[PDB]
Amino acid sequence: TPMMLNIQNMMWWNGKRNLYRATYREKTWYEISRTGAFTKGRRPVMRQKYSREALQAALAMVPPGFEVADVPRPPQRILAQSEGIVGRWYSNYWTLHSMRYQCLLAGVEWPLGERQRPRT
């Protein structure tokens, strides 16, 4: 392959194009590269901020016999994002904890458990 021989086939250049490659890159290498926009460090992932009885009505719909400790923090490979409050919202790690902090500021009692740190 010409990509192996380090040939520049870019279309604006020689008119050609490299043969083994996708025709549409939904995100190019640069913004795949930037992990800060993707992973969650230092960044809010749930944008809507709910009122008191909003929060209480959200908690109202979590099924009994549910603990927080059973929802693992997803790997770095996975995008960090939240849908707001949707069906089975408590299943989304980021939504669950974001909500938890919203409840903390609001003085809303938090019915679910808390995150357990297992140790050898």
Binding site: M10, M11, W12
Partner: peptide
């Protein structure tokens, strides 16, 4: 490609073919 051309110094636009079509 033994040595590559400097392609970063060009804005991306298609030049006209020198045996230009009529």
């Amino acid at each position: 490609i033994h040595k590559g051309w400097r392609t970063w110094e060009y804005q991306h636009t298609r030049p006209d073919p020198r045996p230009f079509p009529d």
